[PDB]
Amino acid sequence: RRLEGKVALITGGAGNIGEVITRRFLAEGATVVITGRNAEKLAVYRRRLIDEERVAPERVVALRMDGSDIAQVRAGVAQIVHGGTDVPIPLHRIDILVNNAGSAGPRRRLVDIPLEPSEVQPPDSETLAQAVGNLVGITWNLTRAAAPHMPSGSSVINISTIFSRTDYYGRIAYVAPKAALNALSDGLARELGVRGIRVNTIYPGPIESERIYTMFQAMDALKGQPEGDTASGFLRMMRLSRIDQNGEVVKRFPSPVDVANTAVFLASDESAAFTGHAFEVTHGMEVPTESRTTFVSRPGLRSVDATGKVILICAGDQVDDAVALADTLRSCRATVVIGFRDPRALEKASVLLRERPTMTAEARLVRLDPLDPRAAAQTLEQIHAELGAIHHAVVLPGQSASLIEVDDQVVERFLHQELVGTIALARELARFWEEYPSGSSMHRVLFVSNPDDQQGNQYSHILRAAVEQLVRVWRHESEYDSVNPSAAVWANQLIRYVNNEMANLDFTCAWVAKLLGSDRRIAEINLYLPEEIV
Amino acid sequence: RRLEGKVALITGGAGNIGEVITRRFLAEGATVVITGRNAEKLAVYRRRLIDEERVAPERVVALRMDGSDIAQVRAGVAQIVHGGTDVPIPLHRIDILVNNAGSAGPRRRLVDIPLEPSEVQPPDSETLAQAVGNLVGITWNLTRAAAPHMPSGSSVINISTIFSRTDYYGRIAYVAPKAALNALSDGLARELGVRGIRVNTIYPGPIESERIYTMFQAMDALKGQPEGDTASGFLRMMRLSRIDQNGEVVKRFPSPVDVANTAVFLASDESAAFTGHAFEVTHGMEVPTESRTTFVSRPGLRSVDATGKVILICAGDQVDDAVALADTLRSCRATVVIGFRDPRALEKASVLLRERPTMTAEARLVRLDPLDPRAAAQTLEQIHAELGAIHHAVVLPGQSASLIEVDDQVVERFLHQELVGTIALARELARFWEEYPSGSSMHRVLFVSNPDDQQGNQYSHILRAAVEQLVRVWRHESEYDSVNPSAAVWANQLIRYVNNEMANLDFTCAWVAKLLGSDRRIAEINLYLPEEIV
Ligand SMILES: NC(=O)c1ccc[n+]([C@@H]2O[C@H](COP(=O)([O-])OP(=O)(O)OC[C@H]3O[C@@H](n4cnc5c(N)ncnc54)[C@H](OP(=O)(O)O)[C@@H]3O)[C@@H](O)[C@H]2O)c1
Ligand SMILES: NC(=O)c1ccc[n+]([C@@H]2O[C@H](COP(=O)([O-])OP(=O)(O)OC[C@H]3O[C@@H](n4cnc5c(N)ncnc54)[C@H](OP(=O)(O)O)[C@@H]3O)[C@@H](O)[C@H]2O)c1
């Protein structure tokens, strides 16, 4: 009835939740195309729907498709629209896109996340880069491929997870890409809204499923705590108690049909007024959408003394910004190293650097590319041998328009250089700090965004979301590990791009120096420049 | 089908949106009790449903009930459960409570809001206090009266408005009580969740209805701008374009059925996993849930010079806090007046006050009760005659557990003393400042919350929400009126209760002095103390 005559594409349609979304969509009259990597599991599920639930064979199509590969996505969407080998009847359009597919990523503490295929250890099957492609790359690929074939009034439904906004020890390779997906979905709602295509996000809590109990078992083991501790923490956070199988009003997990019923509402015309909207299937867990504060003053640097602190600035190609940060830190007497991903930027910075009395030497310049982990680890070791430690780090983006009408290689470079690259850098720093203990004084990390791009900062928003959840879990893992066998890491993220004034760089540099050279520590993760500094 | 055999109570069920909620609920198999103040309109609508839509008479019950009167609410709920004169068949329970009733309040700029019945001018029919009772009092009353008769799995659906979070010139008597309702709903979700009763809030945008066009017509007139300007601003804010009656993909208002369809989803078991959740029926208007920042430093007072600034502290009964604020402002050389609602507090403060070199006289003490507007206006005039002006004001709460199991008079005193009282005070200050121009220098107002109540601060959250939206619209009205015929008002709200440390009062006083005595102005409305000051 409610999805009568609509064409739905459900990725991961044979998974634990996907099976229930598929079933409910069929009961409501949709024609469903289910995708997955395991072609047999798709065929078996399709057969069960036909043979045991009296579903007409024309209404279910099984289509193998690795959604992390844009070539496969385009080929599969073409088949759906025009017919093909695996699609017997051309379906002409997609009315509902359920971006439900999502791997679990490698389950490891940040220090242990595998970056290269040879590092992947049995329980896991994915590098960091593969997890990114199977979590946010996949949703991005399907939406770009499908959007030309979705008429006005169509519905894009992205499945994220509430845990993209909570502590989630040992799952940074999962929750940081899912946080990126949240910001991608909000940018897509803005872009597709002009076409009448709505884009909404479901955030399931822990859902009764083999998946959640497998993951919670692994996370209890990663933390060295008893079975059931991860679940107990989230059960306590729920506000809504609910009838369980024995009729008792208790804390319990929501079920897959709860998620499926939300997807039906969003797929149907009953949700026609919603876009860019969150749906938290969590029994009322109180989880903020963002941890943020706004600077309301400029700090005085006269009191800031970083004598004897080694501070590594990790830059991509941002010569002038990196040099300005180094100048400010050096005026506070810090021992500064600047690392550059881009060798041309490194050369340009050497020239620039050659251009009250102070006994502070000029910054050392090194090559530091986190996408070459073995060279990065060696560079950090050489710095430790020469300077004795690395106390703090400043992390800039990896490189200095539309989210849909964009070349495939621009999307791939963004995912690789900014998401994988930034998380890989944090992995390399965390590992180095664990391997080279330097006492109990916290290591401080400041992520700093790019400046305003004059075009809405759509891609910077995605990096911001990923970095916030990287920071949240890194803070928790490092605190926990420092008590239960090592210094903890405190981290924040400075957001420059909401301010477009000439004083922006100077204001940012002053706060970086204040936050690294003084005792002040800020609880909020994201630290925004004000819109007007003066 | 989806509400088969459920008992729904819909307040305002014969209004513009209520009629459509009622109709959809009946189509989905519910038995519906509709309430309103106009008994005839209810009877006429019930007759139309029976005579023109083939609805069985047993399934619709018309019940006149002014939901702002708790006595009437209890009597009507008793009738619904046990049967009575207007309820022929006892219904035994309430499965769905739709708190949809809501007046429009007096439509006036803050300076013109009617406080007393004789001030109400034709277009309007309500004082400020009546509007509060018809907007948040009503929802509070019904939920408390109905909750004992709602079994586990039941659903409370509160209709607020997105405009409780946006600019809305000339509607403070409407949007500030609706903002209070938002925080009341979140506290109720927490309290009722242990019983398995979920509580969710719908935030409609502008909904195609006689109501919205009547209100937008009045708001265009209040601002002296052309017909259609208010609507044009909100149409621009929508992200989702949508098919209109002629098949064009354009900006348009959502319809009443959009709101009704959301209420059906929330009434049905398909939403069983949702509580404390917002549903924004707005075509994706980007509207934050809160304007806030967190203090990340303590300010230096040595540079703060308020010489020649008259600052009025408006206190209820908070002797020690008011005196501490006065001491701090006087050490910054301000000319201080303290007003007290409570005459006993005024006497206690006189005794306390009698208890580097400075030439700053002790604070003047006056009676200032905003619920006696004629005496308040005279007091402000006498201060102006004696001291020459009132530059800035600090506003404390009117008085120094559960939201359900609470005596009726505690609820009534909170609504009257804190909500009506605080808005009435701002009305009195705004009017005084308009009547006694003192140049173009902005008047600054700092609302300051109570300290931590050690019990979750449920009532303080409600006042916080109302004050934030009071501030938002007051800032906009006063800015607009200062350009289009007068000084603008800047206001903020300091939140003390998230911090429970001994340094709390001193830290708060320092920021009050800094924000009133220096040039710094903060864009965010709510200014939170950090959880840890040191
Ligand atoms: N408690 C929960 O289960 C829970 C809570 C919050 C969020 N979620 C989200 O819910 C969604 C569904 O997961 P689930 O609970 O059903 O777990 P699941 O059983 O592991 O399902 C994951 C699905 O994703 C598919 N998939 C992964 N990578 C893919 C790729 N590159 N191309 C195509 N398909 C791919 C898998 O297909 P193959 O098996 O063929 O690879 C599988 O069907 C995920 O996005 C997950 O993050 C789950
Ligand atoms: N564009 C929109 O219409 C819009 C947008 C956002 C939010 N909303 C919200 O939607 C809800 C429904 O309003 P509407 O659009 O249907 O406008 P409406 O036609 O004015 O409906 C308001 C209803 O509230 C009832 N009511 C008011 N005070 C009452 C009291 N003390 N006791 C009992 N009933 C009372 C009225 O009943 P009587 O007529 O008998 O007094 C009437 O049925 C309101 O809460 C409103 O704030 C509306």
Numbering used by the authors:
A (entry chain A), B (entry chain A): 5 to 359, 371 to 415, 421 to 505, 514 to 562
Article sentences:
Malonyl-CoA reductase (MCR) is a NADPH-dependent bi-functional enzyme that performs alcohol dehydrogenase and aldehyde dehydrogenase (CoA-acylating) activities in the N- and C-terminal fragments, respectively. It catalyzes the two-step reduction of malonyl-CoA to 3-hydroxypropionate (3-HP), a key reaction in the autotrophic CO2 fixation cycles of Chloroflexaceae green non-sulfur bacteria and the archaea Crenarchaeota. In contrast, green non-sulfur bacteria, including members of the genera Chloroflexus and Roseiflexus, employ a single bi-functional MCR to catalyze both reduction reactions of malonyl-CoA. Full-length RfxMCR was a homodimer of two cross-interlocked subunits, each containing four tandemly arranged short-chain dehydrogenase/reductase (SDR) domains.
The crystal structure of RfxMCR-N in complex with NADP+–MSA was determined by the molecular replacement method and reﬁned to an Rwork of 19.62% and an Rfree of 20.81% at 2.0 Å resolution. Although the P6522 crystal contained only a monomer RfxMCR-N in one asymmetric unit, it was packed into a homodimer in the crystal. Although SDR1 (Met1–Pro292) and SDR2 (Thr293–Gly572) in RfxMCR-N had identical architectures, only SDR1, which contained the conserved Tyr-X-X-X-Lys motif, was resolved with NADP+ bound. Surprisingly, we observed an extra electron density that precisely matched the reduction intermediate MSA near the nicotinamide ring of NADP+. The carboxyl groups of MSA were immobilized by hydrogen bonding interactions with Tyr172 (2.6 Å), Arg175 (2.7 Å), and Tyr178 (2.9 Å), whereas the aldehyde group was hydrogen bonded with the hydroxyl group of Thr165 (2.9 Å). The nicotinamide ring was stabilized by a hydrogen bond with Ser213 (3.2 Å), and the ribose oxygen formed a hydrogen bond with the amino nitrogen of Lys182 (2.7 Å). Specifically, the side chains of Arg41 and Asp70 in SDR1 were flipped by ~7.2 Å and 9.3 Å, respectively, to stabilize the NADP+ adenine ring. Especially, the α10 helix (Ser213–Gly228) was rotated by ~20° toward the substrate-binding pocket to cover MSA and the NADP+ nicotinamide ring. This resulted in the closure of the MSA-binding site and shrinking of the substrate-binding pocket. In the structure of NADP+–MSA-bound RfxMCR-N, Thr165 stabilized the reaction intermediate MSA by forming hydrogen bonds with the C3 carbonyl oxygen, which facilitates nucleophilic attack by the NADPH hydride on the C3 atom of MSA.
